[PDB]
Amino acid sequence: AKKRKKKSYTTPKKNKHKRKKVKLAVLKYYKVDENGKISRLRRECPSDECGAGVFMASHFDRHYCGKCCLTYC
Amino acid sequence: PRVLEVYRGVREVLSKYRSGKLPKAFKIIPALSNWEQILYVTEPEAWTAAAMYQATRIFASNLKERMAQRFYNLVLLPRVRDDVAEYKRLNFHLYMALKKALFKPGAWFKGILIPLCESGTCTLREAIIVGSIITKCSIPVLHSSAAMLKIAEMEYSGANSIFLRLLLDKKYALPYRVLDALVFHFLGFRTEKRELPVLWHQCLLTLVQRYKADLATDQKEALLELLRLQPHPQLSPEIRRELQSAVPR
Amino acid sequence: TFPPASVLLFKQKSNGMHSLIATGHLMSVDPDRMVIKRVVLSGHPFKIFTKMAVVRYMFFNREDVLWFKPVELRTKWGRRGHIKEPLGTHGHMKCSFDGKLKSQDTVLMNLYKRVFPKWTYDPYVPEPVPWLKS
Amino acid sequence: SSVMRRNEQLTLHDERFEKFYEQYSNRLQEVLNDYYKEKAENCVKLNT
RNA sequence: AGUGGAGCCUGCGGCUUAAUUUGACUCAACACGGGAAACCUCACCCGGCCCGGACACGGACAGGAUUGACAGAUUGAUAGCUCUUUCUCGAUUCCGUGGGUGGUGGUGCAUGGCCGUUGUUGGUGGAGCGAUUUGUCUGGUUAAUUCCGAUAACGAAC
Ligand SMILES: [Zn+2]
Numbered sequence A: 001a002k003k004r005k006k007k008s009y010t011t012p013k014k015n016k017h018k019r020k021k022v023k024l025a026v027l028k029y030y031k032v033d034e035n036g037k038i039s040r041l042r043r044e045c046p047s048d049e050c051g052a053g054v055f056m057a058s059h060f061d062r063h064y065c066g067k068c069c070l071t072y073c
Numbered sequence B: 001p002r003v004l005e006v007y008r009g010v011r012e013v014l015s016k017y018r019s020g021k022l023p024k025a026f027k028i029i030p031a032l033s034n035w036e037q038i039l040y041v042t043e044p045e046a047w048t049a050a051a052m053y054q055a056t057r058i059f060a061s062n063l064k065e066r067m068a069q070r071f072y073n074l075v076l077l078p079r080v081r082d083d084v085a086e087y088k089r090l091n092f093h094l095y096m097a098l099k100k101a102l103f104k105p106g107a108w109f110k111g112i113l114i115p116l117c118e119s120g121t122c123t124l125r126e127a128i129i130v131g132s133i134i135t136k137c138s139i140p141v142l143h144s145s146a147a148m149l150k151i152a153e154m155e156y157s158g159a160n161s162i163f164l165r166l167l168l169d170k171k172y173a174l175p176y177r178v179l180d181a182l183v184f185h186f187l188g189f190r191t192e193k194r195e196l197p198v199l200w201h202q203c204l205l206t207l208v209q210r211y212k213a214d215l216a217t218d219q220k221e222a223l224l225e226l227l228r229l230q231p232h233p234q235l236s237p238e239i240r241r242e243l244q245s246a247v248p249r
Numbered sequence C: 001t002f003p004p005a006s007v008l009l010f011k012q013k014s015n016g017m018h019s020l021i022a023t024g025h026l027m028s029v030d031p032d033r034m035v036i037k038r039v040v041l042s043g044h045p046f047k048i049f050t051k052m053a054v055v056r057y058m059f060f061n062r063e064d065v066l067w068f069k070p071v072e073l074r075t076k077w078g079r080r081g082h083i084k085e086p087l088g089t090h091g092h093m094k095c096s097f098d099g100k101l102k103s104q105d106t107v108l109m110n111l112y113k114r115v116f117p118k119w120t121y122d123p124y125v126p127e128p129v130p131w132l133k134s
Numbered sequence D: 001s002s003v004m005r006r007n008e009q010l011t012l013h014d015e016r017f018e019k020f021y022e023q024y025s026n027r028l029q030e031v032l033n034d035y036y037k038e039k040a041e042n043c044v045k046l047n048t
Numbered sequence E: 001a002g003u004g005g006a007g008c009c010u011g012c013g014g015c016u017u018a019a020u021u022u023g024a025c026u027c028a029a030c031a032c033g034g035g036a037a038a039c040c041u042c043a044c045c046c047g048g049c050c051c052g053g054a055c056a057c058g059g060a061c062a063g064g065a066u067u068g069a070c071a072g073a074u075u076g077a078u079a080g081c082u083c084u085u086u087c088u089c090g091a092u093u094c095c096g097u098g099g100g101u102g103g104u105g106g107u108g109c110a111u112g113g114c115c116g117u118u119g120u121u122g123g124u125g126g127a128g129c130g131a132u133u134u135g136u137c138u139g140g141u142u143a144a145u146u147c148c149g150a151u152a153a154c155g156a157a158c
Helices: B002-014 B035-041 B049-061 B065-087 B092-101 B105-119 B124-136 B141-153 B158-168 B176-188 B198-210 B217-229 B235-244 C063-067 D026-040
Strands: A030-032 A038-040 C006-012 C018-025 C036-048 C052-056 C073-075 C080-086 C093-097 C107-114
Touching (some): B002 B035, B002 D026, B035 B065, B065 B092, B065 B105, B065 B124, B092 B105, B092 B124, B105 B124, B105 B141, B105 B158, B124 B158, B141 B158, B158 B198, B176 B198, B176 B217, B198 B217, B198 B235, B217 B235
Antiparallel strands (some): A030 A038, C006 C018, C036 C052, C036 C107, C052 C093, C073 C080, C080 C093
């Protein structure tokens, strides 16, 4: 049957928005003393299921949980 | 009681939902204890396609594979089977919903694939659409191998060969017990008097192009006898030539 | 020059090697022999009803369709028609045809202009090297 | 379990199948009061 | 009794418009599409986000690939599909590239699945080499090859 030309047309879509990659984020959770003591910079949530492991995102005023959406002031 | 009015309101919201931010009570549904009663209040049969896609996203995002398992078994698969039977095609939002349900492979395999291929009422269009949805998604080797073994163990239907071939098209390394089971399956079609569709022949073909390096001599001659007893004017010489042009181990 | 006259067309390939590309003779000489360049614009009929259709991608403006309104459209499957009205601000247009268009089909129009040869005449020609194959 | 066996040349992984076939609150009123405030902000009726 | 003359309403052309969606033009075109459309109902227009497959090759990822996310700032829209906050989520991966390679395609062709019962034209005979003709007709009758009757025709099926 009759074939089509398949018009080419160029449109640049190479630029797309991507979130910034954070490299080695485990450094800011703990501070290590020279003797070997661990100091926790961030709060640990007393939640029902995700306790003892989840640290808090530190806002300008407040700490925020990232698994169960816990609220504080 | 007092929560019933709020969940009735969000039920009325989901009946006309198109887009936008969902109410926050819906995003905390898997954190509830009596979540099945809440889900029955929200009436999932009356949900829209985008709302159900976002519900599948929410339930897949919140872990707990058994809850996602029962949600896929009770809610998603009946709606898919109703939608394919009516419009003869799957919607875009529900297609993305099954993709987001394949964001958790363990709940999807036991919940959508295995009940559909074990029911026996799976049609051709449902099989092609769903198998293409597996084909789109990258899958773990162990999960796909177990799905292979389970499909090879159950009873044969025209739909099952489509899933079997499209899982063969992933071309992963296979456990050898799975190869034993599929060889036993195709040798279970050695004495069958039923006429076989072209899909079974193509599935056996793609098996012979891919896994010819892991075929022992005994099953090689057994598949040669299978080609002898169940021939095809076009595909059988292809499988035969791929059998004589194979190196083991 | 007056016919009969034999005509040879060579091309300078590389290293002064003349490649014979064409041959023939001299026809009647006149500048009145009109040479017409044809340009074919293609569009896709994407809304098909009976005897009329909505076609896109042939143009992209609105006044572009109004400019080429008196030119009739033909079709690769043999239909003949003409533009009725543009509708979109983009190059969407209404086209009437003698028959019903297929979904596999494609509308196209022919535009014509007269083209004249370039003035690159010079009697000097380089001397050829002996010819050899490659 | 079949009869014919892969016999020779290595088994990389054992593979796990015995888990698949063998298978077969202040937050609530906090979020609900947030939803109350949200649809009460849908038509505010008061601010100038 | 009216219509055609007047005003209004509605339909079809024609005119404007970015759009004033659309098949049908003397019955079967003409309040048909239950079509009395302020959002859906809408096929039309003007703008704005999102991503749009498998397979091969080259990268990153376990020194996180990616998902989900409270509050505030934005565009015409509560856009965690961006920023401050980057907190959890453990591979369920996403970033280029190359293929008239493609598939939730379109369309045509071939042939089969789901349900049961066992006025026109032939069969035989006559006429003609044949196209054809008789039946299917003088008369009366009938909406009608219907009926009465005649009869190289006798019986029928729809
Ligand atoms: Zn959280």
